[PDB]
C-alpha cells in the first residue's frame, strides 16, 4: 500500500487587502489514501463553517481537495491551514503568506 503526503497551498480567491470580502483557500493535493483532516485557523482558532469540494483525483491517482470559507482580511488577523494525514506524525500548519 503506497502512501503520499499532501501538498498544501494557502491563498485567497482574489488579491487581498483589508476590509474587503474575499475567500480564504486551503488546497490539498497529491495525497494517498484519501482520509484527511483539514482545518482553517484564524489567529489559532478553528473557523467553524468551512466547506470543501467533492473528492476527486489526478492522472497519477493522487487525491485533491479545496477547503474554503468566506472571510475579510485585516491588518492584525492571522490565518492558517492545519492538515493531518496518515503520512504525517503531527498536524502540519501552513500560515497564509499574504504577498507571496
Amino acid at each position: 500500500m503506497i502512501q503520499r503526503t499532501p501538498k498544501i497551498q494557502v491563498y485567497s480567491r482574489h488579491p487581498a487587502e483589508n476590509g474587503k470580502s474575499n475567500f480564504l483557500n486551503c488546497y490539498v493535493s497529491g495525497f494517498h489514501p484519501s482520509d484527511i483532516e483539514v482545518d482553517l485557523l484564524k489567529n489559532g482558532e478553528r473557523i467553524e463553517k468551512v466547506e470543501h469540494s467533492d473528492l476527486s483525483f489526478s492522472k497519477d491517482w493522487s487525491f485533491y481537495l479545496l477547503y474554503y470559507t468566506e472571510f475579510t482580511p485585516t491588518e492584525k488577523d492571522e490565518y492558517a491551514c492545519r492538515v493531518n494525514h496518515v503520512t504525517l506524525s503531527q498536524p502540519k500548519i501552513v500560515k497564509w503568506d499574504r504577498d507571496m
Binding site: 501538498k7 497551498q9 491563498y11 480567491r13 475567500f23 483557500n25 488546497y27 493535493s29 497529491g30 469540494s53 479545496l66 474554503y68
Partner: peptide, 13 residues
C-alpha cells in the same frame, strides 16, 4: 513551479 490550483470560482491560479 507551484501546482495549478482552483480559485473556487471555476478559475485556476
Amino acid at each position: 513551479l507551484v501546482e495549478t490550483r482552483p480559485a473556487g470560482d471555476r478559475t485556476f491560479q
